[PDB]
Subunit: 220 residues, 2 copies
Amino acid sequence: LGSRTSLIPTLGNLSNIILSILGKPVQEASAIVTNPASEMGMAFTKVMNMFRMVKDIYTEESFIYSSAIGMRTPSQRSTTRRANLAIFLAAVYGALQIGFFHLNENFLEVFAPDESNILTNQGTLYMELKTQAYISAMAQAERPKGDILNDLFPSDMAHRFLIRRNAKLTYVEKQIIEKCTARKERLANFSPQEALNEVYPWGKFLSEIACYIHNNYSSI
Amino acid sequence: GPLGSRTSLIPTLGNLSNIILSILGKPVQEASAIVTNPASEMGMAFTKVMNMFRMVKDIYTEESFIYSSAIGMRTPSQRSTTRRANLAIFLAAVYGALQIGFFHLNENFLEVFAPDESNILTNQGTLYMELKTQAYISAMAQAERPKGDILNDLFPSDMAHRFLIRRNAKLTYVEKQIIEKCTARKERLANFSPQEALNEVYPWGKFLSEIACYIHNNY
């Protein structure tokens, strides 16, 4: 498709700006998003408005799936990978409205795309994301904790790892499964449940994810 | 500049400019249909590009065109990007994709087509005369102003001073040729009946094709 082909430089430029704004120290990035009338806040708002428009050209869902839209060249795929990181970081800072269910479902495609090797720090980030999804889902008083936890920390994690790389399990993969199992149990047996956000504060997760996305992808 | 400011967005400005130059780079009837039928598949897609271009353009200018010296775009690639963006603003304007009056188009023509005090070329002066011609034809349709007021504005007497002032200055042989081609075109327009046959004497689609062809070969 022509417009998706021709707009790759814009997709890339806006994604890079978002990543380098929202990858700053958490206090600095949070300030930018929560003060739209500041100098940098106003500039971020215009960048985000253009980004929302360009993103809609590439996907009607939460993230961009390069294979699904025929984006096949090395530069096209590298750009959509950057875009997906910018989307994820903007979602977690609230600049985009993407629910925790979609963040969890797409986490490996965003941080370990193209059947790459899953790394230990990705696994740790995965576990903390699932923990925040659980804490947020509990706050809606919609479904019981058991149901939430079985979705977020599922029994088929090993088959999912094999499927995603066309495969038995690697050492990191089995460590993640074991770390996730332990976190599920701690979460289910914790009391009082309403205290979990003090135990796993959001600000700490924000700092975890920005540092990863910064210190694993080049900024500016 | 700072993150997310005018220097940060230069690749987006150039990319959207290049897209507008490519799409309105098509044959006149094709390009015109894209703009005039916003419901077609191409028309719908072009609309989304133009909405993005409108937003990025506002970041670079409050007016019709982008003056790099006015907003501090100092690096060579930055200055070349604003120059190209100006060509795309002008191409979009004559196709109806952007709403910029003939007055703004006339006033910014040399800055758009001959920036940086380059010596005017006879071809640039030709198209300048053709643009003034079309701006007159349109101004006489609207018929809010007397014929002399309109010919004054578009074919003015101080055309000599303007060419001199433009390059910090006596005219070049080419520049005095343009003024005489201009004055003669004015006399013909000041004395043409029916005044609404001028649309047939100089067809708009001919001008459009001349501008587009010029831009398509000089951007």
